[PDB]
């Protein structure tokens, strides 16, 4: 008869015993290197050039394209729930706005600057972050100014990007986040802020590690910033490029970045860990991209996972990997969940 | 009797099982129990059975508790009863414990280590690549991630 | 009677047991830090100024000096077998071509640029690397412009080398590999590419660690680039110079190199390991030189070793030492071997 | 007309200039981390059980199988030339000597112990090293005692190996070098020496990093120690196994090794470098194996390289990689070369 066999054992080694550290709910909280708080949440906003807008973005569950006149009523509850910061994304829909040099990017009458002014007035305590790029304002849909061949033109690009960033800061943005990924733009932006006497009041949140991938889909729907005549594989880091990512982190830090953003998040947790070592003295931010966000929702609907559970798991993962800030579309949910 | 894991009896039983699989012909054994010090007993068992030189010990050194093991419980019908595995599997926020578990398993004889889940724990894989730099690291794309 | 003695033993220590990790064929593959793939192979090419050339190089078994008109038929099978990249070497044979400043180096009608144009046209998917130096175009046979005393003239040399490199890139080369070993040439080449607006499309593969030795023989036959009035012991690193090699690696990296090459390979595996630590974020390439290559062939003929076996052993050694790319004359063989 | 182009240059950067450190012959010597001296050379000896032997080993140029009665006249000149140490290898040719447990390994009447006694008497100042293994004394040709299945039997093996090592030391060997590569043999050998009260006088030179390869050929001819019924791929490290090699080095050191040997040499220079970091406080020895040695000779005959030149280059390479001792068949040559 097959019976249960038990091998002869040796006395337990103290070094084997780890269980004493997480056998209680409170202990699992104590084991966390960083605890998730409401003030680490950064909610993205898609401001449209139509002040009465409030359009739902198909590929982005529960997220819409808001116009200035609908901002107050939208923000009120969130701010009351503890929202401390937002990241602005402009979505100029009016025809004849987009061009080869992203002129509309810093248009004072544009959605971004209009949004900055509104928020600084209606929600003076909110921290305003502005994404800096040309992709949503270029006729070609690329992040910077191009060469006749269609390839990125570094010099003209960073020159234009620096202007945009300084202009947002001039309008009142507390922080600028260049997501272009073009070589040396951080240095030009920092120098520009210095020359404009705004470097002491403007936080530079660089998307130091932004990889190219299949997770930016839904975003291209909410802001209509899709490439034309190719992909961003030449500026955004290759998914397998750890060395380049590490070099980009060191570069951006050396160029003046006050903090860095890792995008995507979950799919690049190892890069977040690398960043926490290289940029140990700077705040690291995780960006839970549209694709990752939409992926969780899809899986949830399919019953593969539980929304709240996986959201907490994924977000706690960012903190474990070293991040202390999080840009997520789940901000509204967390402002609630963190209360309980 | 209280329902809590019994380390001694557990590793004693697990070691027997692992050695038996190797005796049957398995080239490698991967303990996914996550119970304190099972790697040492399994390695010692293989040594005593004269199979340690032919059996690769692939330890699930870093196995976190989470919401991604669902589908697996359907394919093998191995779902907990009267509680969860939160007392043996590492807490999602537990980086320190994970690092300590990696060092422990390595020191106990593991020939390679497995990180589970994968995608949701890429940072732990990176930690493992430094701590267990001389050993092969394996990623386990779990049912939940796959689904 | 002498009998076999067995000392009293103690229970086996777990820390002693390593055998569990490599007792199976698959395991020995899992133990490899990097696995050899077809796309890591870089095949050198010796383009002659005689379009109908196809001369065999005595000291270089199975290797010849090809002319443009024989390139198509030579490359076809290789590319079909998986060849992804080649490294061009010009061998201008026409008299009155060589001079004191290597004028012919970037001659648009020369073998290198002619080769670039041909390949970009007939094999558009092939990655083109060009070795950058003056040794094969100078009347004196040295790597750079000389002083009246015969000693290397840094300034004029790097100035000329930078021009050559930019010109190859202008012709269409995807990557440039300066093998001159002259102080600070990487910086001038990078700056030159920047000024020519080609730095974003040109990979700079620096021969950061190139030692002087007895293994470059056969090469001097295939390209006729032998020194005149001395040796290269003043620019190429001394075989015992580890400190200088480490300093050269850091220097080249800091000067803009995108990747580095270690030459020779087998005889300098320790330097490859040093490079994998210093230049951890950059791709490291091993160059299996003519002497090493010819040495394996000789030993094989003598029956000392087996060609295929030692080739795999030596090449796997490069990967073990940290390289992820390999320039070897055995490329054709590997394109076959890797299939089985 | 194509003219030589010279790009505009910037003032030379001090950090680019490395040339000032190796522009003179003496400087290239100063750049060496370690200089090659006669006392670092260890000459191998193949003692036969036929006292009047002096047979030439085909696959091993200029090397023979010597009997005790021919040892004096062979050693005299070498010792006079500066030879300070030798490594003994036994080659029992008498029939019925080899068996399943390598009984003859420590046979007092065997070549090794007979050699130790002779040398200690005729050349009292010579340092005697003995290779420790069973391969040359087993009927199966393997390094240790086997299981019925043909697989290595760790326990019985190290038990037998420890006895052999202690016996050689008892006979008068100053140092023992276990080249078996069987898990934990160093610990048993050290413990055995301790129990025999010889640990304070016996240097344990472990072949901590011994890889399996295609370079041990000629050796199997000089000592007739070739495997039977398989290869040594289960005990000797796989060529791609850097992790295992590093673990083996740490293990052997922790087990009592006083020094370590890296075999092969040239083909494993990166491992020598790894060893120089892990075993920084212990002397590292490079073993220029028969295959590597025969390879140099073959290439030399083929005119691919110059014997003396490549020998110096390869041997200086060991020192560069971190070794301070060298076991080489070129010892006789170096005892001459180092004089000039
Ligand atoms: N330069 C645009 C930008 N800045 C931030 C991410 C958006 C992240 C998301 O998809 O939610 C993107 C889109 C892109 O890179 O294509
Ligand atoms: N001890 C069971 C075991 N071993 C491997 C994973 C399966 C991974 C998967 O879900 O695909 C599980 C399930 C569990 O931990 O609940
Ligand atoms: N600057 C020429 C150059 N670039 C690459 C190596 C060729 C490597 C080989 O010999 O195969 C050489 C020859 C030299 O340094 O003498
Ligand atoms: N255990 C035998 C032993 N000890 C040293 C090397 C000899 C090195 C040489 O080939 O010169 C060998 C041979 C082997 O490993 O097959
Ligand atoms: Zn953009
Ligand atoms: Zn040259
Ligand atoms: Zn042996």
Question: How would the blueprint of this fold be written?
Answer:
This is part of a larger assembly, with four copies of chain A.
Chain A: H1 25-30, E1 41-48, E2 54-56, E3 64-66, H2 68-80, E4 85-91, H3 111-122, E5 127-132, H4 154-171, E6 175-178, H5 185-195, E7 203-210, H6 219-222, H7 242-254, E8 259-263, H8 269-278, E9 284-287, H9 290-301, H10 307-320, E10 325-327, H11 331-337
Parallel strand pairs in A: 1-3, 1-4, 1-10, 4-5, 5-6, 6-7, 7-8, 8-9, 9-10
Antiparallel strand pairs in A: 2-3
Helix pairs in contact in A: 4-5, 7-8
Bound molecules: ligand PBG (4 copies) and zinc ion (3 copies).
Residues 131, 133, 135, 143, 179, 216, 219, 225, 289-290 of chain D line the site of one ligand PBG.
Binding site for Zn(2+) (chains A, C, D): 133, 135, 143
Family (chains A, C, D): Belongs to the ALAD family.
GO molecular function (chains A, C, D): porphobilinogen synthase activity; zinc ion binding
Give the structure's gist in a few sentences:
The structure is cut from a larger assembly and holds four copies of chain A. With 340 residues, the first copy, chain A, is an alpha/beta fold. Chain A is built from eleven helices and ten strands.
